[PDB]
Amino acid sequence: LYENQKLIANQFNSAIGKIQDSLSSTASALGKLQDVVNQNAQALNTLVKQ
Amino acid sequence: PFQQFGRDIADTTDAVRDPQTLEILDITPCSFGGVSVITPGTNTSNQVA
Numbered sequence A: 001l002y003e004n005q006k007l008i009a010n011q012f013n014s015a016i017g018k019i020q021d022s023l024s025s026t027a028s029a030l031g032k033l034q035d036v037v038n039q040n041a042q043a044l045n046t047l048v049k050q
Numbered sequence B: 001p002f003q004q005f006g007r008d009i010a011d012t013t014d015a016v017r018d019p020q021t022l023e024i025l026d027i028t029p030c031s032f033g034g035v036s037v038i039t040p041g042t043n044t045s046n047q048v049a
């Protein structure tokens, strides 16, 4: 680390940029939250229709 | 232009029309909420919120 600190910082910044870009591409990354909300919403919706 | 009756998903009327006149009406159950008694124990006090 103490000999390659600048390289490690560059790679870390690049990785953060890449993950930000991936998050700014599609919502399918958050496929779990969009299910924990969509299942409860669907349950309430099908309870209304009863 | 047909019947004075309307319906929704929950099968409870929402929009109707008057018999005597021809004005459209929107039906909506009035202010409904839910009470939530915020209280300490009985022995410490009786005042609630």
Ligand SMILES: *[C@@H]1O[C@H](CO)[C@@H](O)[C@H](O)[C@H]1NC(C)=O
Residues within 6 Å of the ligand: B020, B021
């Ligand atoms: C019924 O009431 C409506 C609205 O006031 C009126 O236009 C209509 O002429 C009435 N019908 C009668 C009095 O037969």
Ligand SMILES: *[C@@H]1O[C@H](CO)[C@@H](O)[C@H](O)[C@H]1NC(C)=O
Residues within 6 Å of the ligand: B040, B041, B042, B043, B044
């Ligand atoms: C009721 O009395 C007990 C003492 O026996 C006390 O410790 C407790 O705090 C009292 N209840 C409340 C809600 O404070």
